[PDB]
Structure formats: C-alpha cells, structure tokens
Amino acid sequence: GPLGSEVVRCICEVQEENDFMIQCEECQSWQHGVCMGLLEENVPEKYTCYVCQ
Ligand SMILES: [Zn+2]
Ligand SMILES: [Zn+2]
C-alpha cells in the first residue's frame, strides 16, 4: 500500500505467497488463508483480517 506498506501482511510474518491468499476488506493487505483459519470454501465475501476484525 502507500508509504511502502507491505502488501502481504500476515500474522506469520512471512512475505512469500502460497496457493491461497485473501485480501482484507478493511486494510486491503493480503494474508494466507490458512493462517486466518480459513479454506477456499469458507472465506466470506466480506473477509476481515486478524488485525482489523
Ligand atoms: Zn501467514
Ligand atoms: Zn485488515
């Protein structure tokens, strides 16, 4: 994001993407779905990350 904020900002603090990334509706950064306790089939349309929820 602006001011060079990290696009991948997950609780695991790993920047590398995997096969299932999800974008927070509030802060607009991305997390690994598995870190957020989610699966492809249960991530909601209005997903909010660990920081923002
Ligand atoms: Zn993660
Ligand atoms: Zn967020």
Short mmCIF file of N, CA and C and ligand atoms in Angstrom, two decimals:
data_model
loop_
_atom_site.label_atom_id
_atom_site.label_comp_id
_atom_site.label_asym_id
_atom_site.label_seq_id
_atom_site.Cartn_x
_atom_site.Cartn_y
_atom_site.Cartn_z
N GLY A 1 0.84 -1.20 0.00
CA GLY A 1 0.00 0.00 0.00
C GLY A 1 0.87 1.25 0.00
N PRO A 2 0.26 2.41 0.27
CA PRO A 2 1.02 3.66 0.23
C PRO A 2 2.07 3.69 1.30
N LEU A 3 3.04 4.58 1.11
CA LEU A 3 4.15 4.68 2.04
C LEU A 3 4.87 3.35 2.16
N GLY A 4 4.90 2.56 1.08
CA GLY A 4 5.65 1.31 1.06
C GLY A 4 5.17 0.28 2.06
N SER A 5 3.93 0.37 2.54
CA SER A 5 3.39 -0.67 3.43
C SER A 5 3.38 -2.01 2.71
N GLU A 6 3.49 -3.09 3.46
CA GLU A 6 3.60 -4.42 2.87
C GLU A 6 2.25 -4.86 2.34
N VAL A 7 2.26 -5.34 1.10
CA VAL A 7 1.05 -5.92 0.51
C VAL A 7 0.67 -7.23 1.18
N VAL A 8 1.66 -8.08 1.44
CA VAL A 8 1.42 -9.30 2.21
C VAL A 8 1.71 -8.96 3.67
N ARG A 9 0.66 -8.95 4.50
CA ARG A 9 0.82 -8.61 5.92
C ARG A 9 0.01 -9.61 6.72
N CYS A 10 0.68 -10.69 7.09
CA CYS A 10 0.03 -11.82 7.72
C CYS A 10 0.62 -12.04 9.10
N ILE A 11 -0.11 -12.73 9.96
CA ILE A 11 0.32 -12.91 11.36
C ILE A 11 1.57 -13.79 11.46
N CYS A 12 1.81 -14.61 10.44
CA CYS A 12 3.00 -15.45 10.40
C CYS A 12 4.27 -14.66 10.06
N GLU A 13 4.10 -13.42 9.58
CA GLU A 13 5.19 -12.51 9.18
C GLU A 13 6.03 -13.07 8.03
N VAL A 14 5.47 -13.97 7.25
CA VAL A 14 6.12 -14.46 6.04
C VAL A 14 5.55 -13.67 4.84
N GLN A 15 6.45 -13.11 4.03
CA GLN A 15 6.06 -12.30 2.87
C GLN A 15 5.71 -13.14 1.65
N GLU A 16 6.32 -14.30 1.55
CA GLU A 16 6.12 -15.18 0.41
C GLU A 16 4.69 -15.68 0.35
N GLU A 17 4.11 -15.60 -0.84
CA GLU A 17 2.77 -16.09 -1.09
C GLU A 17 2.75 -17.62 -1.14
N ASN A 18 1.56 -18.18 -0.94
CA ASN A 18 1.34 -19.60 -1.21
C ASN A 18 0.21 -19.73 -2.22
N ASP A 19 -0.55 -20.83 -2.15
CA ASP A 19 -1.62 -21.09 -3.12
C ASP A 19 -2.98 -20.46 -2.76
N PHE A 20 -3.10 -19.78 -1.61
CA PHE A 20 -4.41 -19.32 -1.15
C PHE A 20 -4.20 -18.06 -0.33
N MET A 21 -4.22 -16.93 -1.02
CA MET A 21 -4.08 -15.60 -0.44
C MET A 21 -5.45 -14.92 -0.46
N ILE A 22 -5.74 -14.13 0.58
CA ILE A 22 -7.03 -13.44 0.67
C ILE A 22 -6.77 -11.99 1.07
N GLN A 23 -7.59 -11.07 0.58
CA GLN A 23 -7.38 -9.65 0.76
C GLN A 23 -8.41 -9.08 1.74
N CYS A 24 -7.93 -8.40 2.79
CA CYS A 24 -8.81 -7.85 3.81
C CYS A 24 -9.62 -6.70 3.26
N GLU A 25 -10.92 -6.71 3.55
CA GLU A 25 -11.79 -5.65 3.05
C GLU A 25 -11.48 -4.29 3.67
N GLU A 26 -10.91 -4.29 4.88
CA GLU A 26 -10.69 -3.06 5.63
C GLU A 26 -9.31 -2.48 5.31
N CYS A 27 -8.22 -3.19 5.58
CA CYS A 27 -6.87 -2.62 5.42
C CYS A 27 -6.33 -2.86 4.02
N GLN A 28 -6.96 -3.75 3.25
CA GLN A 28 -6.61 -4.01 1.83
C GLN A 28 -5.30 -4.78 1.65
N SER A 29 -4.63 -5.21 2.74
CA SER A 29 -3.48 -6.08 2.62
C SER A 29 -3.95 -7.54 2.55
N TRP A 30 -3.01 -8.43 2.24
CA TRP A 30 -3.31 -9.83 1.98
C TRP A 30 -2.71 -10.72 3.07
N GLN A 31 -3.41 -11.81 3.36
CA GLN A 31 -2.98 -12.81 4.31
C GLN A 31 -3.02 -14.18 3.65
N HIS A 32 -2.31 -15.14 4.24
CA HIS A 32 -2.51 -16.53 3.84
C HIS A 32 -3.79 -17.02 4.48
N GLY A 33 -4.70 -17.58 3.67
CA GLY A 33 -5.94 -18.08 4.22
C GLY A 33 -5.76 -19.09 5.34
N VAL A 34 -4.78 -19.98 5.20
CA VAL A 34 -4.56 -20.99 6.23
C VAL A 34 -4.17 -20.34 7.58
N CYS A 35 -3.39 -19.27 7.54
CA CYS A 35 -3.07 -18.57 8.79
C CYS A 35 -4.29 -17.96 9.42
N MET A 36 -5.26 -17.56 8.58
CA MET A 36 -6.50 -16.93 9.06
C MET A 36 -7.55 -17.98 9.43
N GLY A 37 -7.18 -19.25 9.41
CA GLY A 37 -8.07 -20.31 9.86
C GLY A 37 -9.16 -20.62 8.85
N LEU A 38 -8.90 -20.33 7.57
CA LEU A 38 -9.93 -20.42 6.53
C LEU A 38 -9.50 -21.42 5.46
N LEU A 39 -10.48 -21.81 4.66
CA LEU A 39 -10.33 -22.65 3.48
C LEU A 39 -10.93 -21.89 2.31
N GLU A 40 -10.56 -22.27 1.10
CA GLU A 40 -11.14 -21.63 -0.07
C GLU A 40 -12.67 -21.64 -0.01
N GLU A 41 -13.25 -22.71 0.52
CA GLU A 41 -14.70 -22.85 0.51
C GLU A 41 -15.42 -22.04 1.60
N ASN A 42 -14.71 -21.56 2.63
CA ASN A 42 -15.43 -20.85 3.70
C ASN A 42 -14.97 -19.41 3.90
N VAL A 43 -14.04 -18.92 3.09
CA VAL A 43 -13.72 -17.49 3.21
C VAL A 43 -14.94 -16.66 2.75
N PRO A 44 -15.41 -15.72 3.58
CA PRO A 44 -16.61 -14.96 3.20
C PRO A 44 -16.24 -13.83 2.26
N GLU A 45 -17.23 -13.36 1.50
CA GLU A 45 -17.02 -12.22 0.61
C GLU A 45 -16.52 -10.98 1.36
N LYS A 46 -17.07 -10.74 2.54
CA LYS A 46 -16.63 -9.60 3.37
C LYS A 46 -15.59 -9.97 4.44
N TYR A 47 -14.53 -10.62 4.03
CA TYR A 47 -13.47 -11.04 4.91
C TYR A 47 -12.67 -9.88 5.47
N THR A 48 -12.42 -9.98 6.76
CA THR A 48 -11.62 -9.02 7.52
C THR A 48 -10.53 -9.76 8.30
N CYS A 49 -9.31 -9.23 8.23
CA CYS A 49 -8.14 -9.93 8.76
C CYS A 49 -8.01 -9.88 10.28
N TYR A 50 -7.00 -10.58 10.79
CA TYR A 50 -6.74 -10.73 12.21
C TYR A 50 -6.54 -9.39 12.90
N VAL A 51 -5.97 -8.42 12.19
CA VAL A 51 -5.74 -7.11 12.78
C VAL A 51 -7.02 -6.31 12.89
N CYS A 52 -7.82 -6.35 11.83
CA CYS A 52 -8.95 -5.47 11.62
C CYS A 52 -10.24 -5.97 12.23
N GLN A 53 -10.36 -7.28 12.46
CA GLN A 53 -11.61 -7.82 12.88
C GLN A 53 -11.93 -7.40 14.33
ZN ZN B 1 0.53 -16.25 7.00
ZN ZN B 2 -7.15 -5.99 7.70
#
